[model samples]
Target: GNTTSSVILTNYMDTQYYGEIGIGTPPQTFKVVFDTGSSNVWVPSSKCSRLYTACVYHKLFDASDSSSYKHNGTELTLRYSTGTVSGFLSQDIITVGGITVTQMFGEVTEMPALPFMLAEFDGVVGMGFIEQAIGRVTPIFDNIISQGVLKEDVFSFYYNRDSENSQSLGGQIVLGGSDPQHYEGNFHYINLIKTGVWQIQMKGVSVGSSTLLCEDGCLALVDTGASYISGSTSSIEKLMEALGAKKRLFDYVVKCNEGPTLPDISFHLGGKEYTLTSADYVFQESYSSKKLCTLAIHAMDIPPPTGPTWALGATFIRKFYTEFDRRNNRIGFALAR
Candidate 1:
């Protein structure tokens, strides 16, 4: 049996479009958009030399106010396709959902590309692997465990994208255990592809009723947050052609809207078959003019092929309950209610 106490934080009235993190020991207020994709909690510096469109949110960590905000003179650099930002690491008190985890690692940035971050998010509170934690070796989860906020070292997540309920977008993060209400039966765990930067695996892909058995090099990431389904152009085209899907136009985007409902695509993981519907694997274009719109599964033609093998967005994940268990270094999937 899971031996952990769960705390429900309700009454979230903030209408902003970001994920909120309640602050203070008892959580006086909330800060939004702490991402698990990367491990780095950054807030707009009090000494922010320039203002961008995203500066509307209240800046929480003021280096001018906290004596702990010491500049080690070390430069920190983070880069993405959108742009890059350089800054330094600092220490501060991070309060989230009414829990104050002191001596937290954070970043103070002078400037960053404004367009990349999701709308309205002041900064990011990264809750990824321990090795990726900012500043200190301790992660936010470790602090939670040490403070007795949660018993088990394990943490799992279940994101329900289909829920029409407005509150569903701010999906709950179950610390130390899985939320039984969101899942049924035991977890169906899969082995992570060893080389990709993102959590990807090469499960056989299909279109309509036919399966495409490719070589081991075919890669796919199991991204739960992506709202669309996509893959490589060649693979997707071949799969669509096999399904006899007629090319259609929507808003100038090329897509296949009149194909047979894609059959149940099964992933053989841990000796179990995890099946997904055709709708779960494809994205019809909303535009009517483009005849070759990309599938949610985007295939890259990079010379080095250093990125993800394939990107599985939300469309593919909505059919099942997926959990990211950091402590176990594995992702668990189960049937959803």
Candidate 2:
């Protein structure tokens, strides 16, 4: 009943975080993004052409190397905000945070060259809903619980923010239970609105004392893989204006000299107001002993049904300790340490 495991995640400057996992019999170890943005596990296939820079740079799975490897031959393609990944379905024994389970995963034969060529991780292990999985395959987390790997059906994430040191301990993901050490105070719980995504209702968004967006309500996705808070172009533009940041090329940058004076941004959820100070919502970098700050929110148009959805990414997660309780179909948040 007390069984739980915490996987140490390596931080990539708060842009991405990943952890190690082993797949197949001899257990080929690979670093993978424990992404909550999707619902399928995938790694590059050894058969991938070298023309695809992603396959050449990242570690590839070789079926011949694992005695436990099973051929599924099911074709699947996944689309992310960054790029597209095409692969085929396969089966193997996957080990995560010391817990081993038989799992079906993707052997990516092709991937976008631009994004993955410089990616630090070899693969991605999705922690999203089965309803979002291609072919509606059961998600790895579902298998972890249905197979009775633990008495509790819950998981938690803690992403430590340390942009200075590349070798610093990044963060952790606790499986089957929540750890008390990573957070402070009681959690503010919120029920999910749907099944495909870890979505919740956002009551409102504001800057300082003025309400700017989501005055009535809005759908928000708590995405671990996303690097910024994303919303409709119009909504994000409003936020940018309120924050006194102007769009520059692809990002919203503010005068580093005036960064500390920026107003706080708040989100009302579950009838509770959670706020982010300037430090929490801006990425600061130094050059020539001069600082440059960028707003950690982005403008994007998500399509209908899911259109206009707000995504609370790493910027938000870094401040709030998050818990995903599968058994109760709810999420919990507490102030992070």
Candidate 3:
């Protein structure tokens, strides 16, 4: 995936948002998940009777707290890859950091199947593109920008997956603009497919010194939040086979026990070239153990209408600096500093 510039918002300390159900007097304080993909801050309600070991007992927001609080009792449903959550909507006061945002949107869910729940978090706070400013608008880097924070809008992220040490990677979030220090080479800009998504055209793929396959019919989507770079089953299989990488017994899985002869593969996006090394494509499962796993770059066959041809994940995005401009519908990429 081509790299681009973006702002970074870290998980600050947690806060309690109150909620109430029906004529219930006591309020519940549920956990939240702060996301930048959407603009909203909602939590599970105390009325939730779901059976989960991690579920915390908290109060739901009571509409009678403030005159501005409005209880539409409107049913709301949210969908994710893991599970679905539905509940009523209510306006309430939400405090983040030290700033109190009034009239914030909140959700009350009676039952939720959350696979992405952490014991330390109560709910999610959406920081994505919002419609105007129904809630107080601020990025996690607001305080730094207000105080002449760091240098650039360039935010770096390094997420350690399933690590014992709880690996973390975050760089500067240059408020108001980008910093020149984070980049060393020319910026490569891609024309974003204005389908309201960060989609692009993928012409073909190459492995090492060989051009495995070329197809103008294929389309790719660069998703920074994604964990791995993925491609169509046939295309990826041909590319991997050409590179001498062993296929797994199951779909979307690969084995590189042959000791890293996998060549550096490159994807042709539009007319530009974005390459990934064997090391980048293959991950070491353990430093102490000799276990290694190569990425299953192909799409699953069970799905009837496969969405996008290819999806670039963190492994690919980390190679370049990427930026997503929703307002302009453009995604930019540059060499990482």
Best by lDDT: 2
Over the stretch 1-337, how does candidate 3's per-residue lDDT look in tens digits? 1223233333221111111112212333444433433344556655555464334544344455445555656666655434555666665544433223343454546444345342244555543434311234343333323443334432332222222333332333222334456555766667765533456777777887776675555666665434466666777678766765566564333343643656778888757888877666666453332454656254432231325457765566556666554435556676655
Model 2 over residues 32-124: C-alpha lDDT tens digits? 998787899999999888888887788989998999999999998988767888989999999999798889999999988768876889999
Q: Compared to the true structure, candidate 1 yields what TM-score? A: 0.69
TM-score computed on alpha carbons, candidate 2: 0.95
**lDDT of each candidate versus the true structure:** 0.50, 0.86, 0.49
Residue 96 of candidate 2: its Cα lDDT?
96
lDDT per residue for candidate 1 within 160-195, as digits (tens), equals: 444347555434556667777877898877666542
What would the TM-scores of all predictions be?
Answer: 0.69, 0.95, 0.62
TM-score winner: 2
Per-residue lDDT for 175 in model 3? Answer: 22
Q: Provide the lowest-lDDT 10-residue window in model 1.
A: 8-17
Write the number of the candidate with greater lDDT, choosing between 1 and 2: 2
